[PDB]
Amino acid sequence: VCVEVPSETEAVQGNPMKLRCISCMKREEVEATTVVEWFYRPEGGKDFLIYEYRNGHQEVESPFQGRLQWNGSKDLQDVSITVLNVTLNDSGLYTCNVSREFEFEAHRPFVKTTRLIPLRVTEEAGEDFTSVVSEIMMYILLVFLTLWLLIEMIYCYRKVSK
Amino acid sequence: CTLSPFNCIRRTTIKVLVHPFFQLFILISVLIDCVFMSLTNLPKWRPVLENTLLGIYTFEILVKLFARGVWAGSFSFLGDPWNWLDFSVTVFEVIIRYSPLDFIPTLQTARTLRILKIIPLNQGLKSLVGVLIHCLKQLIGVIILTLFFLSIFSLIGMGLFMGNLKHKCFRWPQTGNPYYIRETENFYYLEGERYALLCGNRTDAGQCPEGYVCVKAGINPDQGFTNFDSFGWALFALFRLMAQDYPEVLYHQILYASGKVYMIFFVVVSFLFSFYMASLFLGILAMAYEEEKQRVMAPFTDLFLIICIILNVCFLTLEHYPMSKQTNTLLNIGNLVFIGIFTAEMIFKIIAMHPYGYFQVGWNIFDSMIVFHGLIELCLANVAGMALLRLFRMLRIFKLGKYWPTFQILMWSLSNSWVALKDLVLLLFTFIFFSAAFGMKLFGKNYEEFVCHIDKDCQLPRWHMHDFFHSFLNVFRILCGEWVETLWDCMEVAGQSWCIPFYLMVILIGNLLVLYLFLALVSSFSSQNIRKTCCKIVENNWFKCFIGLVTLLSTGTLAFEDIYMDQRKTIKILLEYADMIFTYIFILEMLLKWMAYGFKAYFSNGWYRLDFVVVIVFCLSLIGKTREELKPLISMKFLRPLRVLSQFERMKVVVRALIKTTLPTLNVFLVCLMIWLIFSIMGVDLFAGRFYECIDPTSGERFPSSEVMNKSRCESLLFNESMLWENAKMNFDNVGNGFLSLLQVATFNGWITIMNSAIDSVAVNIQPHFEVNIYMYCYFINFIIFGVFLPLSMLITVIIDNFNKHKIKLGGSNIFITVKQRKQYRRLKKLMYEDSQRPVPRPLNKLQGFIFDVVTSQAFNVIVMVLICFQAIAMMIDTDVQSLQMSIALYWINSIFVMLYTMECILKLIAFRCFYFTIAWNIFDFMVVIFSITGLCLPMTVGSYLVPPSLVQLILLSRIIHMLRLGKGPKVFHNLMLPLMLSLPALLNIILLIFLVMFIYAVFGMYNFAYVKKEAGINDVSNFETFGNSMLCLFQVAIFAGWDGMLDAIFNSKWSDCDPDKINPGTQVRGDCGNPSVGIFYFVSYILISWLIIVNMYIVVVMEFLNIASK
Ligand SMILES: C[C@@H]1CC[C@@]2(OC1)O[C@H]1C[C@H]3[C@@H]4CC=C5C[C@@H](OCCC(CO[C@H]6O[C@H](CO)[C@@H](O[C@H]7O[C@H](CO)[C@@H](O)[C@H](O)[C@H]7O)[C@H](O)[C@H]6O)CO[C@H]6O[C@H](CO)[C@@H](O[C@H]7O[C@H](CO)[C@@H](O)[C@H](O)[C@H]7O)[C@H](O)[C@H]6O)CC[C@]5(C)[C@H]4CC[C@]3(C)[C@H]1[C@@H]2C
Ligand SMILES: CCCCCCCCCCCCCCCCCC(=O)O[C@@H](COC(=O)CCCCCCCCCCCCCCC)COP(=O)(O)OCCN
Ligand SMILES: CCCCCCCCCCCCCCCCCC(=O)O[C@@H](COC(=O)CCCCCCCCCCCCCCC)COP(=O)(O)OCCN
Ligand SMILES: CCCCCCCCCCCCCCCCCC(=O)O[C@@H](COC(=O)CCCCCCCCCCCCCCC)COP(=O)(O)OCCN
Ligand SMILES: *[C@@H]1O[C@H](CO)[C@@H](O[C@@H]2O[C@H](CO)[C@@H](O)[C@H](O)[C@H]2NC(C)=O)[C@H](O)[C@H]1NC(C)=O
Ligand SMILES: CC(C)CCC[C@@H](C)[C@H]1CC[C@H]2[C@@H]3CC=C4C[C@@H](O)CC[C@]4(C)[C@H]3CC[C@]12C
Ligand SMILES: CC(C)CCC[C@@H](C)[C@H]1CC[C@H]2[C@@H]3CC=C4C[C@@H](O)CC[C@]4(C)[C@H]3CC[C@]12C
Ligand SMILES: CCCCCCCCCCCCCCCC(=O)O
Ligand SMILES: CCCCCCCCCCCCCCCC(=O)O
Ligand SMILES: CCCCCCCCCCCCCCCC(=O)O
Ligand SMILES: CCCCCCCCCCCCCCCC(=O)O
Ligand SMILES: CCCCCCCCCCCCCCCC(=O)O
Ligand SMILES: CCCCCCCCCCCCCCCC(=O)O
Ligand SMILES: *[C@@H]1O[C@H](CO)[C@@H](O)[C@H](O)[C@H]1NC(C)=O
Ligand SMILES: *[C@@H]1O[C@H](CO)[C@@H](O)[C@H](O)[C@H]1NC(C)=O
Ligand SMILES: *[C@@H]1O[C@H](CO)[C@@H](O)[C@H](O)[C@H]1NC(C)=O
Ligand SMILES: *[C@@H]1O[C@H](CO)[C@@H](O)[C@H](O)[C@H]1NC(C)=O
Ligand SMILES: *[C@@H]1O[C@H](CO)[C@@H](O)[C@H](O)[C@H]1NC(C)=O
Known part of the structure; x- marks a missing residue:
């Protein structure tokens, strides 16, 4: 089962970050030969790669040597990559450029599907905006419901006792 | 002409005719002919026996001719229609045998007709055939109405699906058996499948692989027999759908080519045809049977x-x-x-x-x-x-x-009705034997001659009619349903023009006989003031409505928990908090009820206990999301929809009625369980340990038995070859596996596989050989007859008896409706039995030259109706491969009909000075006219995205719904619609309950069987990935449309093909496997529950029909 979902663009200093990347085939009966490449770009960078899968995981010297991890699938249908101890400086553009080719005994289609990730780590990222407003909604609704119950209890007590 | 009743020759001929030795002699000769023509093969004496029999038959003809005369008008030779058959066949044989002509293959076929002589030689069978003819004459209107609806929905199907089954996935950019090639170089083919993969352009339709594009091209699937490209083949498909025969493959084909949103067509077809028309046939036949029956050391x-x-x-x-x-x-x-x-x-x-x-x-x-x-x-x-x-x-x-x-009373009923059951059983056996022989003589040479058409490797298949045993089995299968796959082979070898009539004869007459026997069996077996303040709050009508709204919302929110859950980021948070809100509301309700009534009164009520356990379920679900150790509690929330049962008065009456009708069936169910246990032990004895086989681990097909003679060869690797020795998914290794196999045989899903295994077994370690043990078919025929057919009559008769009893307990016709709904029932009964008698006054003075009368004339109405019928007829001429002239011709016919309906509407609007909008049907006609004019000339100037070519055609067809109106159509159609419109309330209640149970099971299946690898029954359209897919699977299961593939896929763990650790991208759930125990429980429980509710649906409609007819 494959469902494409974008990666989180926010990381917190001192933790690990998962640069999710899901690129999956229209049909899952089909086999392919997948080539995966990850690129990184500082504001002054030139998009140099930091990882790649080609006939197996390769070793690619870069600033990221030694603190990069693989969290993909055997079928190379999820090519997510994890970074350790994200520091304040490392940020910007991460590129999951994936190209695969199929076999059909008559033709060999080629496809490339790019996926880019804007990463901005910060000193302390607080609770995301959506969750906080959702919690406020829950609290106001809970209070209003209990208030409505209290109001009608008082109302009906008055009416009954009279 | 005759001879004198006083003549020596006529007197002696009459003497011989009425002597019982004559009737017995002819009978014995007939049975000898039957055996030696059908069940025997390869004699050398054929000519002598054949000519002796011809002489005996000729003697019978001469004697009966002289005795009775020729054409006295009745009780003469030509008075009896059977004598026509005997004479015709005898003369044909006398001609052919002793004449230059050699219509030899034709001759033997004709001879098979003499099997039907068994009927006129038995007075019981003769009388039974007479009454059956009378019942068939009673079925005329229902047959006509079924034909009407099948034609209408064939038109609807062509409008919706014409040409779709030609969709393929074309390759873009640009030896063996000649009848089994696959154009893999141009279109995409799945690994094993024979036909090109269907695919569509909608997002809810089949998707192409990469480097392939979807273009309509090529041939239809199933050798061209499955398609909606023309009337006739559309009628074939709709008749296959009435019978619900092998329908799941048609569903998959149509929902691949087009979108999954077209499943409404199939659900509506099921309800209208498999349920309601079948109910009408059953009611007519049951009433006919009733009318006939009324015409006729020691101690402790x-x-x-x-x-x-x-x-x-x-x-x-x-x-x-x-x-x-x-x-x-x-x-x-x-x-x-x-x-x-x-x-x-x-x-x-x-x-x-x-x-x-x-x-x-x-x-x-x-x-x-x-x-x-x-x-x-x-x-x-x-x-x-x-x-x-x-x-x-x-x-x-x-x-x-x-x-x-x-058990004693059951056997007593059987014995007491044995006399009547004997005639029906003998008639059914005669028909089956005659049909098997007739089919063999018609198609055996064809099956052998054109063998390569229906089997790669050009060997006879597992189902055919080359010899008599397989003919008998084919007919018997046809009587169980299951008549579509073998019809394709028949037509491939013989041809459409010959197979279709024979199969229709078998289907229709066998259905009549089997249903009559079933009705006969059923009829045989039948014989602190704050406290009071809280009480005020809780009982208020608005509190109930608010809590009902909350229950519905809490239930519906469960449908969002599908594979796309992590993709919907904000919905996830909203739902997580709404769960707490719902918990709070329901805990407040529990406390308020406690205060109002008093614990003893609270827990003393059945429904409030259900509420309390639902509260526990909510709380346990909440506490489960704190520790991964406590995570398994979460699933409990799927019991939540049971709240819906306790809150709505309708669900409560339906559950009450199901308890009142279907609970007293415990003793009969125990008898049936004993029968099934007998058959399971028998099957373990016959088959246990013998379904093991040596297969190719990858390809999965059995090794030819000429190499792997036994297990030792398979297991022992001596030439480094891959080969695995393993069991079958459905076997008889113990009484439990036996019960599973027998359930799979009783619903006819997967029974061909089990019998294939059965008729291939030899020993406990010997490789099975193809059809080496063919007579085990007697096991399964007996099971179907005795542990499926007869138990069913037992159960159904008990349920009908409880229905009638509890109806008498109320003096009320309906028990599945609420008190508020009885007045609705009375009102409907009034409307569809009473004339409107509410005409309008004709304008006179404002405009004299104003002929109101024309519109209200009978002539105008009848011309309008004939126009509706002709519009319907002109639709049948459409096809997929069509000339350019025919296309424009049909376009102009539709345009002229739009024109003519517009003229009707305008003239009516003139006639009734603004009362036109008072009648509901007039609003329907007005909307039809407006939408038809819109669509017809919407692409004239606006040139919208597009107007589907069949949209105007379909819009015009709806007016034919006017044929079911009392004054504007045949009077029978209204009468045959009355039961549905009188049972509509109870049907609504039962359908709502069915939907609720399906919803619970769909949510549970979403939780369990998503992420299970896609195999036989799990595919793109039917799976447990979303709510719609799961509901499609459950509907498919409820009609027995292939639940064995679903379970076969869920059993992947048994088969050792699944990765318990594969990452599923975009979801935190890991694994690819299923739980066979959960699968078995799931499917067995759902089958039982759905069967019980659906049977009660049938009882309700049929009882309503009987009640209406009783007047
Ligand atoms: C796609 C395209 C579109 C265009 C188009 O093509 C397709 O569309 C297509 C649609 C085609 C029409 C379809 C239909 C008809 C009707 C047919 O002829 C009447 C149909 C016959 C069928 O009758 C049976 O009806 C039941 C069937 O199950 C049988 O079962 C009973 O079985 C038990 C034993 O009796 C009962 O106890 C159960 O209760 C009961 O179920 C019943 O025995 C049997 O007789 C005769 O009809 C009777 O119907 C009533 C029954 O006798 C009677 O009514 C009575 O009603 C009151 C009685 O209570 C009396 O007081 C009233 O005086 C009295 O009127 C009356 O005798 C008479 O009307 C004439 C041809 C026509 C116009 C077709 C022409 C071409 C089309 C227009 C096509 C066209 C080309
Ligand atoms: C006093 C009031 C009287 C009122 C009576 C009203 C009765 C109304 C009935 C109420 C609703 C009934 C529900 C529907 C009953 C019809 C069921 C049936 O006929 O048999 C079923 C049971 O299934 C069968 O296998 C029956 C097939 C018959 C096989 C022939 C055996 C006949 C045995 C007689 C001996 C003949 C000798 C032959 C030798 C081989 C068929 O299954 P299905 O088509 O419904 O769905 C299955 C799809 N997977
Ligand atoms: C097989 C090739 C057919 C392909 C083309 C189809 C053409 C349309 C045929 C239209 C026939 C019109 C009558 C339709 C009534 C169908 C009855 C029916 O199937 O519904 C139920 C009601 O049927 C009955 O119980 C009684 C039917 C009696 C009517 C038949 C009268 C006999 C006619 C005698 C002449 C024979 C005609 C031979 C043709 C030369 C039983 O179905 P089932 O659910 O049990 O199917 C089991 C598979 N799940
Ligand atoms: C006794 C009843 C008599 C009633 C007779 C008439 C009843 C209605 C006839 C069916 C009208 C359905 C309208 C659907 C529009 C025409 C189909 C169509 O092709 O248009 C689009 C259809 O798309 C849709 O709107 C979704 C399909 C809706 C399916 C509706 C099936 C229901 C039919 C049952 C009718 C009876 C209803 C009974 C209610 C209980 C797609 O266009 P396309 O084929 O050129 O290519 C699209 C892909 N690129
Ligand atoms: C699915 O959509 C594609 C859209 O391109 C259709 O292919 C084109 O159809 C038009 C006619 O409408 C042709 O003139 C083009 O040459 C086709 N090719 C393409 C890729 O443009 C295709 O026919 C549709 N298929 C189905 C079965 O609906
Ligand atoms: C309430 C709304 C939302 C849902 C409506 C869908 C209805 C019409 C669907 C869902 C389940 C279906 C039923 C499932 C099983 C069978 C058995 C077979 O003999 C045909 C009729 C019958 C009985 C179907 C009739 C139509 C049905 C009731
Ligand atoms: C399942 C679908 C596709 C088919 C069902 C069509 C039925 C329900 C339609 C077609 C014919 C209709 C009836 C025709 C006659 C009248 C007269 C007037 O008093 C209005 C109601 C009434 C009584 C209609 C009720 C609904 C009706 C019975
Ligand atoms: C072509 C094969 C014929 C199959 C049907 C048998 C035809 C013979 C007549 C059957 C009906 C006889 C009964 C007439 C009415 C009655 O006696 O009640
Ligand atoms: C009253 C029953 C009549 C049944 C008649 C309908 C027969 C269904 C099959 C018709 C298919 C027509 C074949 C046309 C030629 C072809 O396209 O190969
Ligand atoms: C896991 C099992 C699911 C099914 C549970 C169904 C519970 C139904 C409870 C029925 C209570 C009956 C009380 C009737 C009271 C009355 O009729 O007055
Ligand atoms: C209540 C009735 C039950 C009757 C059950 C009948 C089961 C019949 C089984 C037939 C077995 C035939 C075996 C053929 C001999 C062989 O092995 O070659
Ligand atoms: C060959 C196609 C003909 C189509 C026209 C058929 C006539 C219109 C349909 C309405 C039938 C009217 C019957 C009313 C009387 C009755 O049957 O009780
Ligand atoms: C939208 C939620 C769907 C949940 C699935 C189960 C649907 C069953 C709901 C039954 C409601 C019955 C309404 C009764 C009418 C009334 O208020 O009188
Ligand atoms: C990536 O894989 C490693 C090793 O299996 C594991 O320890 C780590 O937690 C994984 N990270 C994620 C985010 O799955
Ligand atoms: C990250 O690196 C800094 C500097 O070496 C170290 O102090 C800190 O503990 C590290 N954190 C992790 C995630 O290992
Ligand atoms: C980030 O950039 C600054 C300036 O370019 C550099 O001093 C620093 O070393 C970089 N990252 C870290 C924190 O190592
Ligand atoms: C992938 O290709 C290169 C790799 O850097 C670059 O253009 C970019 O990252 C991606 N764009 C394309 C062409 O897919
Ligand atoms: C399997 O078949 C072979 C060849 O007939 C035979 O020699 C062998 O004994 C059989 N297996 C057993 C153990 O019976």
């Missing part, structure tokens, strides 16, 4: 014996596979002990009641037979083999029936 020690019998049944149930020596000798010694006990029983009873005394009663004979068989097995078992003697030990389970009051 037996506890020891009953315990001994029960323990013997337990010992029988314990034999399985594999088995050691200790657990085998244990069972041997048990057999010894029990047979000794029963021998002593027989001896002592013989002593006490002197010998004639013993055999005066019927149960003593059965017990003596038990002892006699047991001893003659104990001895003689070891030598010579004779393994079938053991197979009769299960007869001892029937001893348990001597103390069973229910």
